[PDB]
C-alpha cells in the first residue's frame, strides 16, 4: 500500500523557501520509526532541503530531469516512482506539497503529526475531504523543554 506522512502546521502549512523552521526532535523521531526499513519516495525539493539521504531506507527522487546523485533512485513519474520500490508491504511518500498532492488519490493511510504552530509559510498539504477517512489512533503530547509546541500524532486509514 502507499502511505503519506507529513507534519502540519496550522492552516496545513508544511513549509517555508524549503526549511526546518521548527525543531521538534519528538516528530523526528516518529518519522524516523514509521520510514525505516521502507522505501521513501520524495520530490526534488525536498530532496534538496533534506541534505542528505535518509540511510536504512531505499530514497526514490522524482525528478523530470535525470540523476544528479548516484546514492538515490532516480525517477520521472509516479507510475516509475511505486514501480522502482518493487513489491513490499508499505511506501511511504515523504513530500513535498507537489508530490503530496499527486499521492493522495493513490493513499490509503495518512500519518500527520499536527504541530500548535504559526509559521507563514509557502507550501500546504492536501486539502483532503477527510469524509473520506477515518482517524485510527490520536495521540497527544504537550510541549516539553526538549519540543517547544505541543503536536497530535494522527494516523488516519481511508474508509
Ligand atoms: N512538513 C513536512 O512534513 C514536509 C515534508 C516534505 C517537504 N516539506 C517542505 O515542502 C517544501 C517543498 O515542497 P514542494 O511542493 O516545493 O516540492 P516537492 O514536492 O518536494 O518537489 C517538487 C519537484 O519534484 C519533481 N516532481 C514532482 N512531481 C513530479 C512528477 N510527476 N514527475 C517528475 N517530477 C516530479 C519536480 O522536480 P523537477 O523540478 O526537478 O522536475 C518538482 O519540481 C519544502 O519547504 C519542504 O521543507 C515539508
Ligand atoms: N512527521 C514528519 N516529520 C518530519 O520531520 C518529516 N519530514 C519530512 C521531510 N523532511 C525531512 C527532514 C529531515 C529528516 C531527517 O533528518 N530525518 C532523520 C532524523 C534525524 C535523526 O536520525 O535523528 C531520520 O533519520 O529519520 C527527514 C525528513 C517529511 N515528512 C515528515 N513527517
Not at 541534505?51 to 540523476?67: A, C
Not at 509557502?122 to 477527510?130: I, V, W
Not at 485510527?136 to 494522527?154: G, I, L, M
Request: proline fraction near 6%; include cysteine; hydrophobic fraction near 40%.
Amino acid at each position: 500500500m502507499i502511505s503519506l506522512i507529513a507534519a502540519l502546521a496550522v492552516d496545513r502549512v508544511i513549509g517555508m523557501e524549503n526549511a526546518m523552521p521548527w525543531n521538534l526532535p519528538a516528530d523526528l523521531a516518529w518519522f524516523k520509526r514509521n520510514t525505516l526499513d521502507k522505501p521513501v519516495i520524495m520530490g526534488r525539493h525536498t530532496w534538496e532541503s533534506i541534505g542528505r539521504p535518509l540511510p536504512g531506507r531505499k530514497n526514490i527522487i522524482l525528478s523530470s530531469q535525470p540523476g544528479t546523485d548516484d546514492r538515490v533512485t532516480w525517477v520521472k513519474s509516479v507510475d516509475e516512482a511505486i514501480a522502482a520500490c518493487g513489491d513490499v508491504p508499505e511506501i511511504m511518500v515523504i513530500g513535498g506539497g507537489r508530490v503530496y498532492e499527486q499521492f493522495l488519490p493513490k493513499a490509503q493511510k495518512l500519518y500527520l503529526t499536527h504541530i500548535d504552530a504559526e509559521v507563514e509559510g509557502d507550501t500546504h498539504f492536501p486539502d483532503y475531504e477527510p469524509d473520506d477517512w477515518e482517524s485510527v489512533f490520536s495521540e497527544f503530547h504537550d510541549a516539553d523543554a526538549q519540543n517547544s509546541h505541543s503536536y497530535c500524532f494522527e494516523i488516519l486509514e481511508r474508509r
